[PDB]
Amino acid sequence: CSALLDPVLQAPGTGPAQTELLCCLVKMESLEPDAQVLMLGQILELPWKEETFLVLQSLLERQVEMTPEKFSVLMEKLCKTTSMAYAKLMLTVMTKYQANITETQRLGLAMALEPNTTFLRKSLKAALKHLG
Amino acid sequence: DSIFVKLLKISGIILKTGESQNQLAVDQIAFQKKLFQTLRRHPSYPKIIEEFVSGLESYIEDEDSFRNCLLSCERLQSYSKSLIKLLLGIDILQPAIIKTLFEKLPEYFFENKNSDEINIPRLIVSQLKWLDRVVDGKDLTTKIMQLISIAPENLQ
Structure with a gap:
């Protein structure tokens, strides 16, 4: 999460093809609650644009x-x-x-x-x- | 006291609280033509439709009244259509009603199976099925397309 999350979202011209994978990552049953917390902490440090909103919504959907x-x-x-x-x-x-x-x-x-x-x-x- | 309830009472539909099926004094086509001609003849002719739907939507801000308003109604004089369907039968009201319904539909993304195991969103979209006449295809088309893009998985 820490290695790939930041540079992909911060990469210019990031699109649906990228965001779908991040949504899938945050949806993994194996993403334990504390790991979900860590992911949340990492997302909060990114600049906020539509792509960040989609991934954040997907993660917040698990009721973390x-x-x-x-x-x-x-x-x-x-x-x-x-x-x-x-x-x-x-x-x-x-x-x-x-x-x-x-x-x-x-x-x-x-x-x-x-x-x-x-x-x-x-x-x-x-x-x-x-x-x- | 509200434009909505008074027009409905004169036109001949009983708006019940929201617990039991709204009663119907009149035939459905009769009701439609009655409220149609009422709003036709009434002064401030173009604005009463907007006022009417605003009164309607302010009425259906409470859940239960809308829940009964959605269900099929009771004829007193043996089993009939719903009032919402009948009101969308009137072309002038149609786009306003559509607008309201869709705008207020996303309240119900997360409250599924609340009380009586009745899925409000399924019911509300079911209201739009089998319409006689579509006043606007473009508006309905675009609005449902905005809607579909956003919803969570089951509802979408």
């Missing part, structure tokens, strides 16, 4: 536990938009990790979702209101 500090880092990067992939990521975090979401994080999510170009705006609005 997170310390509040790591969760805070995730939310911080999360809160800083026009794409559907970002929307899906945001929705997943807002729905499966609701128990960890503070008021500041909720508002941060609200601000990052504000524009109407994003897909599924209304569902995001509903999830947000549910967190209140």
Whole structure:
């Protein structure tokens, strides 16, 4: 993970052909929870673009536990938009990790979702209101 | 008090809470033409459709009312179609309803088999099956294509 994850995603012109393998990696049953945590830590250090959102969403789909500090880092990067992939990521975090979401994080999510170009705006609005 | 409920009451459908099947005073085609001509004759003629669907969607923000609204309805006077299907039978309302339905469908990615083992997403897409008339193919086509690209595995 540490050797291949970073340079492929940071390589220019990275496409579906690359991201499909990363999604498959993060989906392995053999990727133990702690190894999933490590992968999460590694992904957080990359610059965030659509490809990062896809892989992060795929990893977050396994309901991996997170310390509040790591969760805070995730939310911080999360809160800083026009794409559907970002929307899906945001929705997943807002729905499966609701128990960890503070008021500041909720508002941060609200601000990052504000524009109407994003897909599924209304569902995001509903999830947000549910967190209140 | 809401535009939606009042138009439905005058037009002749009983909007029940969401626990039992909505009753139907009238024939289905009769209902459709009734609400059609009602909104036709009503002043602020082009805007009442938008107001209507906004009232509708604000009504179906609560789950259970929508759950009953989706199911097949009860004729009092012996087993009929659903109200949503009938309302999409009216061409003017159709694209607005489609819009609403799809926008609010992704709420239900992760809540599968909640209460009565009823898969809301399967039901909602089932609402669109077997339509008499498609007002917009292009909008429906593009919207379902956006939708399909994103969903999780089982639902997609």
